[PDB]
């Protein structure tokens, strides 16, 4: 649906059978979520942001439902203070930016 930016653009996600809210984040290449137990194997990796870098675990091929749409892809879990949905999944749910 359409969202204005007077408030942070927060949605519900279900991931790993857990419900969370998350930020839709156009500045973010990748999705990164607070620490969480997902099933499966994961590769260690690192991402940079404002402030510097953090090490995260990368899980691939996980199902997430963001609003009502499902999408599969790579999700980083790690020490972020907010759950962010980056452009990798944003593209799958058909999200555009408009002005």
Ligand X SMILES: O=C(Nc1nccs1)c1cccc(CN2C(=O)N(Cc3cccc(C(=O)Nc4nccs4)c3)[C@H](Cc3ccccc3)[C@H](O)[C@@H](O)[C@H]2Cc2ccccc2)c1
Which of 13, 15, 24, 28 binds ligand X (CB under 6 A)? It is 28
Respond yes or no: is residue 29 known to be catalytic. Answer: no
Residue 86 burial (10 A CB sphere; 0-12, 13-18, 19+): buried
**Binding-site partner at residue 30 among a second copy, ligand X, none, CB < 5 to 8 Å by type:** ligand X
Which of 13, 28, 64, 77 binds a second copy (CB under 8 A)? It is 28
Which of 39, 44, 51, 61 binds a second copy (CB under 8 A)? It is 51
* Phi, psi (rounded to 5 degrees) for 71: -160, 155
- Whether 60 and 73 have beta carbons less than 8 Å apart is answered as yes
């Amino acid at each position: 649906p359409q969202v204005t930016l007077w408030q942070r653009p927060l949605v519900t996600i279900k991931i790993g059978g857990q419900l969370k809210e998350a930020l839709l984040d156009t500045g973010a290449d990748d999705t990164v979520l607070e620490e969480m137990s997902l099933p499966g194997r994961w590769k260690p990796k690192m991402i940079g942001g404002i402030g510097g870098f953090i090490k995260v675990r990368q899980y691939d091929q996980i199902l997430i439902e963001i609003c009502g749409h499902k999408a599969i892809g790579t999700v980083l879990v790690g020490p972020t203070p907010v759950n962010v949905i980056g452009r990798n999944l944003l593209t799958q749910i058909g999200c555009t930016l408009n002005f």
